[PDB]
Design a protein around this ligand. Structure first.
Ligand SMILES: CC(=O)N[C@@H]1[C@@H](O)[C@@H](O)[C@@H](CO)O[C@H]1O
Ligand SMILES: CC(=O)N[C@@H]1[C@@H](O)[C@@H](O)[C@@H](CO)O[C@H]1O
Ligand SMILES: CC(=O)N[C@@H]1[C@@H](O)[C@@H](O)[C@@H](CO)O[C@H]1O
Ligand SMILES: CC(=O)N[C@@H]1[C@@H](O)[C@@H](O)[C@@H](CO)O[C@H]1O
Ligand SMILES: CC(=O)N[C@@H]1[C@@H](O)[C@@H](O)[C@@H](CO)O[C@H]1O
Ligand SMILES: CC(=O)N[C@@H]1[C@@H](O)[C@@H](O)[C@@H](CO)O[C@H]1O
Ligand SMILES: CC(=O)N[C@@H]1[C@@H](O)[C@@H](O)[C@@H](CO)O[C@H]1O
Ligand SMILES: [Cl-]
Ligand code: NA
Ligand code: NA
Ligand code: NA
Ligand code: NA
Lengths: 636, 635, 634
């Protein structure tokens, strides 16, 4: 049925047969705007490669007749919905793609691919036999993002991955309509940008002798040198590759902290420069806030950043320095503080980060940073963007009420380096970027969200995939789909289909995740009973569903363990019409810490007026009766 | 691909590939008989939309052997088997559908449909993706019905469903080759046929304030008015729609009982007319059999019935009046009985139905009624007797007296009953020839009828649930030769046929189709049992040395019989002497509920002089009180 | 790679869509070599019938490049790899079949068949519904056999099957690229070759009253007469049937032992001729080696053999006579040993086989025999077939100038059960004798697998014993040693089995999923269980050092000894404390074994983390159980 991730804003389904691309189908451009023509050509190349169909570009050929073509239109009425909005009208007569801005057409194409057979992505095989149907019926889609900032961050400073890997990540982002690549390119353990005025930033800072592994303070090492960096020509190519796929790159140059690799290259940049690039991930060196050379150096670097990154926003990091380890007691710090009348080390960081916002602004750019740039001593430039990642949400809300745009990256929801125990798939999908205590008038200041793939413990592309996917798919939906249309069980079904595409595209996403059952699948589902140690003193259990049996069809009963030392063993679940059985699903299930076949399918008859309907479930405690659970009843 | 329900009478399979309908295929008529030409237009129109292929009608001689074409022949050889017989000769040379009467061709086309992909029935399906193969090999089919009367009754008096629903029912009947729609159109709770001479029959009799729900005497009501009736224009349109699909409509005007709606419309028609159309289903009002105006009124009604229903037979119901509630101690009745020398209230009823049989005969029609109309001024010998009661001697005597009889034993054919009361198996096992009837009389047993009473049926979907799939079983009972009936095979065929019902929108009962029944194994070898004593060990050995004669798949079925505990099955293996040569190790459970109780073993080509042993590892589930039987099928 | 059995020697895959044959496809020959034009017509006939496509032959230059065409070229470069070598270049623009010798084109065709839908083998199947793709991508194959002698032996002396059955055996051999049919046609219990000069060999020797069943000296029999033989016309027909499919027939006339049938027909041929053709399989009668009549009679037989069997090599068996039962204490033997100075009965047999090898050499042929023929003079060109695992003897045979074939009986005797020789043992067989030095390897020309038929009385039982282990021996004979891979072979054997089904081969269906401890001599062991360990349900096995890549790892719990099995409920993989994969299903590991393999999805490993396999199992009826837990990577 409907399988697009993100789920689009407005969908209208019609009855009949769907559109199908054939060897006779054409792509017609009914506009002269060349931005739309460039998108049309890029759309032709993509669709032809994946389907094998020729799909040549023509403004003529009429619209054939019984050969559904692709029509690209420029519809001004969608402009109220932003430059990323588009509409799709699909029927056997035609497939019309419209947008106010050319970027909408690209996203229309991605929706088109996701409504076609997944084999589109196969690099092998006979595709001349595929039925290239667009969904299962005719339809009208009007679509647009809830949030304008839908970001994925890749940390290449902790471990470098390179052009091939990041282009493959960009491909996943575009297919999910994520539009910001936050590129964390500098940190203590690596510097990954060629700066032509300062060659040692890469010739020294891009190489280290070994890497700590396992976890922080593991005492374990791989004893393996690690190096890599991007040349400025590579960065230009990747910027272009991303922009063609509707993605703006936000570069991050960490400061005043996370500066070890830069300091080793040029030791005057820090008051406590390490002897070599750190081999452990527990070292955080800080730039010297008391020497103009620091600011002069950083401004020269930022000059080259702006020449090769056209995006308006530059991320400085700006998270808190480890004051005790780095500045406390250093004479250059204490005198600097006494002179300028500063009471705290945090005041010294605020001074640095405020000065950098003026340096960034004088380059025609806009500064972004982690929420410490805002506070907790003068105040920060109102134009600065704040990425919230930790603390009381009152800090983000205070910044919003003071006039800052905010990106919600609360680390307990969005840090993809964490395990699936720490952030399960349902926690990623249930993330709500708009802080709940924030008054409605302020909501438009929450521009969106960012998911972070930190790479201390990620050294291969396949491990990067394992950590980033499938949860990045959830964040793409949180960023795009209207809040009122979010639906976690439905998202997980669509995720199964989408996981075929990830396989064919080489993405080693986490396996044991997509098909789990969690209690969050059932907030929108009726509850018909429970079990307790007391109800386990019998094995036959009856639950009334009279009010829920309104029509013929399939009903799914789920016995979901909640807590207790013991699971339940389930023999069968049946539906009774009055006192007679009319459907039974007999199969062994176990609902406890592990959930094994806990869903039972019941076939309801067209209801008998005046009859009662009862779900009867035969189950008992497994090794004991300390078991609590809930019985859910789905009526699709 | 012998999927057809009902099972055809004679089939001979060949070797090779089957015929396939392409966009080149044609339908050519090899006969000028107009009845065949009208049916060919029907066949072409149906098949074109189902398959999405042109399938053009071209006069004979324009047959290109590029593509297999459909040939519609007329073969007088088939007349020995009646007007509904036909033959299908299938091969890439072409598909030849022959028949002595045009009705045979229609059924040939329905069989054609059940041999093609089910996508035929999907209206929005991608039909151009399909290969329209007729079954899977060449074949000759010589088909005809065992019984001439294969009827389904729809009650629209209790609840009215209307034109769209009844055409949908007619469609399912036609695909199952059922040929009689018994239309129960009047009863106590409704009158659904427009009678122009007596407009209150519909203006009053077709409306009631509310309906009892749940069951008789429930004390529950839906509080919802219910109304509806067919105009005579609607009935003519539905008569033709049915006639196109080989179905004769037998109308029923209930009498002398089930008269409440007629009486309330015209209170002189009953001695105990209710004050309003009953809101419950326990009220059964009787026409007044002592008054001439009653007979003249009903004779008038039947005049209008005959004008719009072309069928030869008119049903009156004629089941017993509730004598003690309606007639006993009523002065008119008691004196009528003295004047006529009658000793029982049944005598009064029989006088009424006897007289109605003459009134109907004089209109050039035949009366039909339930067995109450038959006994030992008198009953027209051309009357048809339909039996709800299992009384073989009464049917014997009716046959000797010259009556065609129809068997509708209510404990087997009443589809308003639950599946506990009448399981699918019991419907399929129904034998219309009354048990013990001497063979001399079998030929007057003209068929069967299955009844959908609608007291507790208010939607088309619930009508489907009660009517199907047991109506499929009766279609087979009525068509298939008795010696070719095979319930296990019917169940396999029904599983396929239910795909068609799904796409056609028939909300049949889903849980009743794919059961395993103990009767399935009556002629399957028994290699062992289990008892509480044998469940004290995990491993169980059964000798099958004398049964393993060829390589291939052997099926072990561990079938629970009785006891408080099921058995949980870990694996079943085949041993050649002391060597394991096959093991099916899926988890199974056989008890009150059946969970994967069939185990597939691959036998080697048998080795001379070797012992073969089925070893089954199983134990009691929760205890040892369990008995069952182990069956062994060869390929 | 492909699904072809045997695995080709060199494969190169590319991205994209595969070549596809259509009704417009043609077969084009770009060589004038008439041997290639002949193979091309035979290929056309075979492919058009299987696919239902017309596939007409067209000359180079008169074709439309609309559809993919098959192009047949002669490539002398492949000559260094022998006459059976070939290459295939396939893409949507064409399918080029190349070979140095016309025999290679036939094997190129057999590989094409295995890369197309299996409906090819269904004579009645719906062939027009099928997309005739050559595999799933463009590819380049260069292929050639490792061994030149890839033999299957069928014993029709013990039980006669006949022409229809041997031809369907030949069809399998050809699809598997086996090139030698070793035809065991004479023995104690039957003589199956018509010899016109000695008509009693078949009129007497081809008939027996009944057959022993069960096992040797069972005392049981079937009370059923059994008879049959091939006429010389039938032989010539089967010889050319094999030759059209790249197979040379090596006939076998057993001597000096296994002679009962011959002797009963002509009693002067043995010193201990039985009274009737034996009806048990333990009787082994010896020809009389001390009498000139025997050699004259056998030379006459071999004259007729050479006229209907054209191949260079004739097999005599030559295995040891039952000396104590047949020759010891016989006056003619003891006097013959005195006259000639022989000290052992084996010397008498060696004199016999040595002399037969000269008789066979004088007819323009090469003698072949079991290792007893090597250990007046043995013809230096004789071929030695080893049922005995004796490397020093094979080395000496090679040093004395003999080609040798390896048929180690404990690995290649397909009359044995699958317990004695499981599929994996057949596949793991190495024809190069263990310990043989490299300089001698070139004289190991291949292998032979033997279907003895004492206990095989039907074609279907022949299939059950012969297949699928014959499929493994086909791969041993052809595939390079370093490209062998038993798991991948079982994967391909699944697909090859559809072809066997459609072609009527009643192969043993259960054996591909058998598991033996021998399956795991080269698989890591991550732990064991013992009566000690069975006191708890949860068990933990470290696999930190073994998790190196993403994908499916397999845990096998294999019972070794003890009076009790274990019942298994679940097996899970843990990354530190995070459960990351769980295979929950019921299994049992004891005298019989069910579902004892558990499949786990490893993520891309996290450097420095610990990976732990956790398994739930307990004792079945007790705790006297010992086992080994194995761990396989993807
Ligand atoms: C602002 C920020 O996110 N800093 C670090 C980040 O660099 C990374 O090390 C992460 C790993 O979980 O932990 C954070 O404390
Ligand atoms: C979410 C997070 O990373 N929190 C802190 C962070 O401040 C980091 O800088 C480090 C300092 O030691 O410890 C972490 O626990
Ligand atoms: C919540 C839960 O799964 N509890 C136990 C489980 O830990 C396991 O010990 C087994 C014991 O029988 O089944 C369940 O009773
Ligand atoms: C002759 C006959 O079938 N009469 C009634 C019928 O009208 C219907 O009410 C049915 C419901 O089961 O009960 C029968 O007694
Ligand atoms: C006859 C029968 O099925 N008995 C089963 C019993 O064996 C056991 O499985 C139990 C599970 O708690 O359910 C019972 O209904
Ligand atoms: C040399 C040789 O293989 N001789 C016999 C062979 O004839 C056959 O009887 C086989 C059956 O197992 O046993 C072998 O010992
Ligand atoms: C090694 C082995 O299988 N031992 C089993 C034993 O554990 C128990 O299960 C018993 C049940 O029948 O049978 C024995 O053969
Ligand atoms: Cl005998
Ligand atoms: Na569509
Ligand atoms: Na407020
Ligand atoms: Na003799
Ligand atoms: Na672990």
């Amino acid at each position: 049925q409907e399988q697009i991730i993100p789920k689009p804003a407005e969908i209208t389904l019609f009855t009949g047969s769907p559109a199908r691309l054939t060897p006779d189908s054409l792509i017609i451009t009914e506009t002269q705007d060349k931005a739309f023509l460039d998108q049309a050509g890029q759309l032709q190349q993509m669709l032809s490669a994946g389907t094998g169909l020729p799909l040549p570009l023509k403004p003529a050929g009429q619209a054939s007749k019984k050969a559904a073509c692709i029509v690209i239109k420029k519809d001004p009425a969608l402009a109220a919905r932003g430059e990323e909005a588009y509409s799709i009208q699909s029927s056997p007569s035609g497939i019309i793609l419209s947008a106010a801005d050319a970027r909408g057409i690209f996203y229309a194409g991605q929706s088109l691919v996701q409504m076609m057979p997944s084999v589109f992505h196969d690099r092998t095989g006979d595709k001349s036999a595929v039925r290239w149907n667009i969904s299962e019926t005719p339809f009208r889609i009007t679509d647009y993002p809830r949030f304008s900032w839908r970001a994925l961050m890749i940390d290449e400073a902790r471990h470098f991955f390179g052009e091939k890997t990041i282009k493959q990540i960009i491909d996943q982002m575009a297919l999910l309509k994520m539009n910001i690549l936050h590129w964390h390119l500098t940190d203590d353990t690596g510097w990954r940008i060629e700066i032509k005025k300062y060659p040692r930033l890469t010739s020294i800072g891009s190489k280290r002798r070994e890497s700590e592994i396992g976890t922080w303070n593991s005492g374990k090492s791989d004893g393996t040198p690690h190096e890599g960096f991007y040349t400025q020509e590579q960065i230009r190519d990747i910027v272009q590759y991303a922009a063609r796929r509707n993605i703006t790159i936000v570069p991050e140059i960490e400061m005043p902290g996370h500066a070890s690799a830069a300091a080793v290259a040029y030791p005057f940049l820090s008051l406590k420069t390490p002897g070599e690039v750190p081999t452990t991930f527990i070292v955080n060196t800080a730039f010297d806030p008391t020497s103009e050379k620091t600011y002069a150096f950083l401004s020269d670097v930022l000059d080259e950043v702006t020449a090769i990154f056209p995006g308006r926003i530059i991320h400085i990091g700006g998270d808190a320095v480890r004051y005790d380890k780095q500045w406390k007691g250093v004479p250059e710090i204490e005198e600097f503080m006494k002179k300028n009348g500063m009471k705290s080390y945090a005041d010294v960081q605020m001074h640095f980060t405020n000065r950098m916002s003026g340096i960034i602004a004088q380059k025609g750019r806009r500064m972004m940073g982690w929420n410490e740039i805002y506070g907790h001593g003068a105040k920060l430039d109102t134009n600065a963007v704040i990425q919230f990642w930790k603390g009381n949400t009152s800090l983000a809300k205070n910044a919003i009420r003071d006039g800052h745009d905010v990106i919600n990256s609360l680390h307990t929801s969005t840090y993809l380096d964490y395990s699936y125990g720490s952030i399960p798939l349902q926690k990623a999908y249930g993330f709500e970027p708009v802080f709940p205590g924030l008054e409605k008038q302020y909501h438009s200041r929450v521009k969106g969200l960012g998911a972070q793939v930190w790479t201390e413990w990620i050294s291969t592309p396949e491990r990067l995939h394992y950590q980033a996917f499938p949860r990045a798919c959830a964040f793409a939906e949180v960023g795009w789909t209207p809040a009122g249309k979010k639906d976690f069980p439905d998202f997980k079904k669509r995720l199964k289909a989408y996981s075929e595409r990830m396989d064919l595209m080489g993405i080693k996403f986490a396996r044991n995740v997509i098909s789990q059952i969690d209690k969050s699948d059932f907030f929108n589902t009726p509850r018909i009973g429970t079990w307790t140690p007391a109800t386990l003193t019998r094995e036959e259990h009856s639950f009334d569903v009279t009010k829920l049996v309104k029509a013929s069809g399939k009903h799914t009963v789920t016995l979901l363990y909640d807590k207790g030392a013991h699971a339940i063993e389930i023999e069968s679940v049946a539906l009774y019409e009055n006192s007679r059985e009319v459907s039974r699903d007999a199969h062994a299930g176990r609902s406890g810490a592990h959930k094994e076949n806990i869903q039972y399918i019941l076939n309801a008859p067209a209801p008998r007026q005046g009859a009662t309907y009862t779900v009867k479930a035969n189950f008992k405690g497994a090794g004991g009766r300390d078991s609590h659970g809930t019985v859910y009843f789905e009526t699709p």
